[PDB]
Enzyme design. Structure first.
Site, PDB file in Angstrom:
ATOM      1  N   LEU A 116       0.858  -1.183   0.000  1.00 35.81           N
ATOM      2  CA  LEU A 116       0.000   0.000   0.000  1.00 35.81           C
ATOM      3  C   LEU A 116       0.898   1.239   0.000  1.00 35.81           C
ATOM      4  CD1 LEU A 116      -3.076   1.011   0.514  1.00 35.81           C
ATOM      5  CD2 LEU A 116      -2.423   1.102   2.895  1.00 35.81           C
ATOM      6  N   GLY A 139      -4.698   0.361  -6.473  1.00 30.78           N
ATOM      7  CA  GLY A 139      -3.731   1.417  -6.682  1.00 30.78           C
ATOM      8  C   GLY A 139      -4.223   2.773  -6.231  1.00 30.78           C
ATOM      9  N   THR A 172      -9.453   1.803  -7.116  1.00 31.66           N
ATOM     10  CA  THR A 172      -8.649   2.812  -6.440  1.00 31.66           C
ATOM     11  C   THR A 172      -8.571   2.347  -5.003  1.00 31.66           C
ATOM     12  OG1 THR A 172     -10.524   4.322  -6.035  1.00 31.66           O
ATOM     13  CG2 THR A 172      -9.127   4.732  -7.975  1.00 31.66           C
ATOM     14  N   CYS A 173      -7.492   2.735  -4.367  1.00 32.38           N
ATOM     15  CA  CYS A 173      -7.117   2.346  -3.033  1.00 32.38           C
ATOM     16  C   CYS A 173      -6.672   3.594  -2.290  1.00 32.38           C
ATOM     17  CB  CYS A 173      -5.986   1.334  -3.160  1.00 32.38           C
ATOM     18  SG  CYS A 173      -5.447   0.615  -1.607  1.00 32.38           S
ATOM     19  N   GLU A 174      -7.207   3.797  -1.100  1.00 34.32           N
ATOM     20  CA  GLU A 174      -6.901   4.946  -0.256  1.00 34.32           C
ATOM     21  C   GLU A 174      -6.001   4.520   0.877  1.00 34.32           C
ATOM     22  OE1 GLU A 174      -9.292   6.119  -2.490  1.00 34.32           O
ATOM     23  OE2 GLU A 174      -8.041   7.922  -2.291  1.00 34.32           O
TER      24      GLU A 174
END
EC number: 3.4.22.71
Lengths: 216, 4
Positions: free
Chosen positions: A68, A101, A194-196
């Protein structure tokens, strides 16, 4: 500047190495990945959309947070890597393969996914390149939408074809774009999400779903 | 929910 330019340089260098490896192993794909595994054994694939910034290695750890905040060389970077869900296999693909991502709005990593919410962009970028040790693939985009974390688009496997069909039909129903790609229960899919950062206030996610086609 |  020290982070930014250096980070960018390192990606340019790796992108170049991979383009050289591809041109060298004209028919095959395993040697290209065996070479990339020397850098990091966790590099499981490569994702590329021509004419866009999406041109990155795909990492996989034991958890969905290993990469991450870590890049391909296991160096700490806020934008981390493009990574595959820990549950997924590559040798024999699961029904749904998930990649994550960052989307920080600097035209890097998965910033591109936001562009797929537009019909005009989709039409010009219907196919994404995906390669791994086991083959060369195409990601035939058929759905793009914005959702929350309260919705499970993360499902890796199904109980039966009815459950999978439900999932596929829900995926098409949620789509903000119209596509001519035909996806059946006999097909395998790839979800790009999407990844936070961990414990972030933002709950919204951009999801792009595609049908996996083997081209090799 | 896992990390997304």
């Amino acid at each position: 500047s020290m982070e930014d330019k250096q980070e960018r340089a390192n990606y340019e260098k790796l992108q170049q190495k991979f383009q050289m490896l591809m041109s060298k192993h004209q028919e095959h794909v395993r040697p290209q990945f065996e070479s990339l595994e020397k850098i990091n054994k966790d590099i499981v694939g490569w994702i590329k959309l021509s004419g866009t910034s999406l041109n990155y290695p795909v990492l996989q750890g034991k958890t969905n947070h290993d990469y991450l905040n870590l890049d391909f060389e296991r160096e700490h970077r806020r934008k981390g890597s493009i990574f595959m869900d820990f549950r997924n296999e590559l040798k024999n693909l699961n029904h749904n393969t998930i990649l994550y991502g960052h989307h920080v709005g600097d035209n890097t990593m998965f910033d591109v996914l936001e562009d797929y919410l537009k019909q005009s962009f989709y039409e010009k970028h219907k196919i994404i390149e995906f390669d791994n040790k086991y083959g060369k693939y195409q990601l035939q985009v058929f759905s793009a939408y914005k959702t929350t974390t309260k919705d499970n688009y993360i499902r890796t496997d199904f109980e039966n074809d009815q459950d999978y069909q439900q999932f596929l039909d829900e995926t098409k129903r949620k789509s903000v774009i119209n596509s001519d790609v035909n996806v059946t229960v006999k097909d395998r899919i790839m979800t790009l999400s999407t990844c936070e950062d961990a414990y972030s206030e933002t709950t919204k996610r951009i999801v792009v779903v595609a049908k996996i086609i083997k081209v090799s | 929910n896992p990390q997304t």
